[PDB]
Amino acid sequence: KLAPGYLEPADLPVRLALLGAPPKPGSAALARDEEARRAALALRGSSREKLAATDAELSFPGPAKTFSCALGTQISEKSTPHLYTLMQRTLTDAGGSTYAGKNAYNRTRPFVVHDEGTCRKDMEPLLRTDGSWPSGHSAAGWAWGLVLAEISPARATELMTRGLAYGQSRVICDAHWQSDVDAGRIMGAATVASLHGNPAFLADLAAAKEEVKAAQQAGLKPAEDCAAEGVALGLTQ
Amino acid sequence: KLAPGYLEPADLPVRLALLGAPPKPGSAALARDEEARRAALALRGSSREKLAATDAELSFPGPAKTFSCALGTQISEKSTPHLYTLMQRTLTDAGGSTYAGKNAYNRTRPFVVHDEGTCRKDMEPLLRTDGSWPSGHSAAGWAWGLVLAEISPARATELMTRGLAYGQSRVICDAHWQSDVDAGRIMGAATVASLHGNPAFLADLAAAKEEVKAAQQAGLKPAEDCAAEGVALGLTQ
């Protein structure tokens, strides 16, 4: 159910070297995670939580739909085949697929710690047994934001903001801690640096730039309710 | 003093859109900043503090020297002129000179809040009146780490680790808060994404890849004490 990643395992960024240990028990860092959790759970029942629910969808075309409004055009196999492929393959590179248990911290997720629910009840049987470190959604979101921003520089701010919000959706969903979302962005940026050393990624990147240019010049607007996503995001950037 | 940046002002990543507010008074987020400050000040008098003192040097060849050991060859005008230039110009893009006080938070630095000293007494007269948001050293450190990792993919982990440590040196030096160092990496990664859309940067990047490869193949060792830097950093293989 996973596309081949661009990167060989030996070329993946090394979590242990790049990341610090998770917040220790009794630490202010852990208190910051609980504070972020409490602030996030205040949004339970809101449109932002509902957007966090669709942000959790990693099965394509999930991510493609999620980033279309920020891109200004629809990401699809028909319109942007190379960009679509790039997002699928970089999900493997940046996401939870690389986060093995060996040489990794085991992270008990917030909703398990506090015996409460998430914004995606259907994904919980998987997440309960999952202690991935850091947040793979966060890493993929930031990686997607950084690559897409390079693909369409005229929408760089919208795309990078959307990629950051994608990681924040994991806190709002009560699926992972703030610190793991923050650490996810370190891995996401690092993975993008490695991808720029990969000729296969670079070829798809170059083709995606032409696809997006062609779609925007032809006036293809996103096939998503960008108004509703904007409201859910709050914007006021 | 400052080299021309690659990026036009309109192409700089927008701090206000990408970053959250600084830790509020009485918050666990602020408590985390104080906790990191206390852990950092325990290293006063140590080799790690001494390395943070040279990590503070933004006047070239300061940054070139700082990353040479992680690169595996000396960054110099003679041996890697385009890489040297690239670091100088990306210092302007990423390194805080763009952090205008207008439309930005004013940050009182830790050593000012606690009427104490930094690891660089000579730089305090400027830093005392400076409330830059986030950490420009951190942003440049992470940006340099990410670009250099693409330049020399075989040393990607060493270089990205060094770029994160470069930002952490600001906490160890008591020059800025942890949260501003963390936010610095968001801006650094964003700036790198913008840089990959800039043809002048891309031309220097391609030449730097050839310069570094030629230097490493000729066996040009770093002209820095890599043993001493390894001990000060606590490096683990």
Author numbering:
A (entry chain C), B (entry chain A): 38 to 274
Per the authors:
Analysis using SWISS‐PROT Prf Profiles classifies it as a class A acid phosphatase (Z‐score: 78.97), sharing 50%–60% sequence similarity with enzymes such as PhoC and PhoN. Although the monomeric form of M2‐32 has a molecular weight of ~28 kDa, size exclusion chromatography, dynamic light scattering, and sedimentation studies revealed a dimeric form in solution. The mechanism of catalysis of histidine phosphatases involves a nucleophilic attack by a conserved histidine (residue His 174 in M2‐32) to generate a covalent phosphoenzyme intermediate (Ishikawa et al., 2000), followed by hydrolysis to release inorganic phosphate that requires protonation of the leaving group by another His (residue 213 in M2‐32).
The structure revealed that M2‐32 forms a tetramer, with a Matthews coefficient of 2.5 and a solvent content of 51.4%. In the crystal, the tetramer adopts a dimer‐of‐dimers arrangement (A‐C/B‐D), with a buried area of 1129.5/1137.1 Å2, and a free energy change upon interface formation of −23.5/−22.8 kcal/mol, as determined by the PISA server (Krissinel & Henrick, 2007). The structure is stabilized by two disulfide bridges and belongs to the “acid phosphatase class A” protein fold superfamily (SCOP). The first disulfide bridge forms between Cys105 in helix H4 and Cys263 in helix H14, while the second bridge links Cys156 and Cys210, both residing in the loops regions. M2‐32, however, presents an additional extra bridge on the opposite side to the active site of the enzyme. DSF assays suggest that M2‐32 is a thermotolerant enzyme with an unfolding T m of 47°C and, accordingly, this high stability may be conferred by the presence of two sulfide bridges in the monomer, which contrasts with most acid phosphatases that have only one disulfide bridge. Docking studies with adenosine monophosphates, combined with site‐directed mutagenesis, identified His174, Arg207, His213, Asp217 as critical catalytic residues, and Tyr136 and Ser172 probably involved in substrate recognition. Mutations at these positions resulted in over 90% loss of enzymatic activity, highlighting their functional significance.
